[PDB]
């Protein structure tokens, strides 16, 4: 069942650590586990992960980094309206309330903290909206699925023409 | 049968003692899986105990003595929290906040030694929002969740839209 689910989303991502990041892969690995011990809404787990993907694409620096290299720090923010094709079936009703998480990230070479403030909620308006997947500017290349899996999201590169979310086994 | 949810406090402590230090993770599962060769513990907690032993084996830390001296390594683990698990085994009778200790020798091919576990599970009647048990896995180690779930005698499921729900205990 190819189900199109609409929602408004807001995301604010922050990273603190030493050993400032060089390659995007390490940042993506660090952020992929932002939900070590989730006690949020059960039904909202997968979509937040998709939104975390968005946050990953939007990592930013601040003048704090330009002021000293021994206090690494990254910011990021995104927001808007979108809709997602998915094959998870039916999602429960969703509310509009902010949610916040702060966790320690430990990949060895990189150690620090990651903070995510998300707010995803229903759009009861009846108007059409563009695709959520064709909303970023980081179209990169044909290994988009590899990045999604590295986070732990299975997507499609079939004749469908889009990157619809597929499944869990996000743990590996 | 249908999915039933069970919230509960858990507390865990595991120790493994052996020689020729303990190379790779596959032997971790294979060795620790024999903590209940002759079970005399409280039935009805077997699913919980197997899940809990798996959790503890996942993230066990080798002691500094392993680093310094190779004569007798030692592996330790300890955990505590409140988690909620989906299962379909049946209906569980009332639990209790009592500890349970197990201690057994093991011998898998080249490796031989002793396992000593101490666990405590007990149901919670509160209205808190506890995390899932699966999330308590670090995910920074091991590979695949069906095979390792089988190594302990534990059959699970991979629901597309959700998280893992048990099926039964192979044993």
């Amino acid at each position: 069942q190819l189900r199109y689910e609409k929602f408004f989303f807001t995301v604010k991502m922050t990273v603190r650590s030493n050993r400032p990041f060089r390659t995007y892969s390490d940042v993506a690995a660090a952020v992929s586990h932002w939900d070590h011990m989730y006690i949020g809404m059960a039904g909202k787990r997968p979509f937040y992960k998709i939104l975390a993907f968005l946050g990953s694409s939007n990592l930013k620096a601040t003048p704090a980094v330009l002021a000293d290299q021994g206090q690494p720090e990254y910011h990021a923010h995104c927001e808007g309206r979108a809709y997602l094709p998915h094959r998870m079936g039916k999602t429960p009703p969703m509310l509009n309330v902010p949610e916040h998480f702060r966790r320690p990230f430990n990949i060895g070479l990189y150690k620090g903290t990651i903070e995510l403030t998300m707010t995803i909620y229903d759009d009861e308006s009846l108007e059409a909206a563009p695709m959520i997947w064709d909303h970023f500017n980081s179209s990169k290349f044909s290994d988009f699925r590899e990045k999604a899996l590295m986070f732990g999201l299975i997507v499609e590169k079939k004749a469908s023409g889009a990157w619809v979310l597929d499944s869990i086994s996000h743990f590996k | 049968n249908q999915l039933r949810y069970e919230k509960f406090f858990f507390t865990v402590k595991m120790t493994v003692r052996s020689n020729r230090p303990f190379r790779t993770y596959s032997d971790v599962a294979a060795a620790v899986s024999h903590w209940d060769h002759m079970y005399i513990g409280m039935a009805g907690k077997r699913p919980f105990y197997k899940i809990l032993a798996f959790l503890g084996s996942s993230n066990l830390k080798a002691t500094p003595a392993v680093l310094a001296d190779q004569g007798q390594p030692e592996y330790h683990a300890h955990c505590e929290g409140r988690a909620y698990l989906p299962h379909r085994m049946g209906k569980t009778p009332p639990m209790l906040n009592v500890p349970e200790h197990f201690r057994r020798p093991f011998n898998i091919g080249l490796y031989k030694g002793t396992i000593e576990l101490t666990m405590t599970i007990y149901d919670d009647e509160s209205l808190e929002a506890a995390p899932m048990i699966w999330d308590h896995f670090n995910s920074s180690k091991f590979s695949d969740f069906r095979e390792k779930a089988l190594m302990f005698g534990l059959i699970v499921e991979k629901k597309a839209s959700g998280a893992w729900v048990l099926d039964s205990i192979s044993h």
Binding site: - | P21, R23, T24, V28, L60, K61, P64
Partner: peptide, 17 residues
């Protein structure tokens, strides 16, 4: 690195002045 479980990190940082 040749084994498993032989500490991880030791998060406490001695790699500093």
């Amino acid at each position: 690195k040749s084994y498993f479980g032989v500490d991880e990190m030791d998060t406490y940082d001695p790699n500093q002045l």
